[PDB]
């Protein structure tokens, strides 16, 4: 009969301790998420960076090729131009 107040209190003690742990748990959680998004934003950052770095090298390369092609074309113009000197000079030989 009197025994009732003795356990209601033992239990209230237990419940607080239980709540204290969910509180202690929810705190490590926020840190975890914080750490989650800190880690994250960085990876995306790094990623994005590598991407442009290459986008950059590509375009850079693209132009170099375009260049070597003009270089080759220009070399070819002269070679086919020597072809006709060889011709006008083979002619002069064999009449």
């Amino acid at each position: 009969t009197k025994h009732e107040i003795s356990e209601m209190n033992r239990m209230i003690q237990r419940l607080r301790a239980e709540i204290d742990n969910v509180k202690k748990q929810c705190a490590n959680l926020q840190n975890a998420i914080a750490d989650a998004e800190q880690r994250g934003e960085l990876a995306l950052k790094d990623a994005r960076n590598k991407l442009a770095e290459l986008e950059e090298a590509l375009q850079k390369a693209k132009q170099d090729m375009a260049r070597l092609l003009r270089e080759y074309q220009e070399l070819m113009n002269t070679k086919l131009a020597l072809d006709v000197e060889i011709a006008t000079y083979r002619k002069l030989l064999e009449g």
């Binding site: 209230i12 989650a36 991407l51 090298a57």
Partner: protein, 93 residues
């Protein structure tokens, strides 16, 4: 006399609601974490994919740039022989 056991149910049940509030918080936190870990893993995977695409394109171009300087060299080793060839014909006159 009988009031003490009454105040205790009051405070007891009050705690039970604070528990419910804590569990609701915890559960809502768990959601947010997994969800965070997901959004970035996938956005990252998405960027990692864009990155690889460009790297391939780049690799290809350099292999082509390899063949195109090689081609130039050939052209040169010829244009030179020709220069030599006209040089000789001019030497005959």
């Amino acid at each position: 006399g009988k009031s003490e056991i009454s105040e205790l149910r009051r405070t007891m049940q009050n705690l039970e609601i604070e528990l419910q509030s804590q569990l609701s918080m915890k559960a809502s936190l768990e959601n947010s974490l997994e969800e965070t870990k997901g959004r970035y893993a996938m956005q990252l995977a998405q960027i990692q994919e864009m990155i690889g695409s460009v790297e391939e394109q780049l690799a290809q171009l350099r292999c082509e740039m390899e063949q195109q300087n090689q081609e130039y060299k050939i052209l040169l080793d010829v244009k030179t022989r020709l220069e030599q060839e006209i040089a000789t014909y001019r030497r005959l006159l």
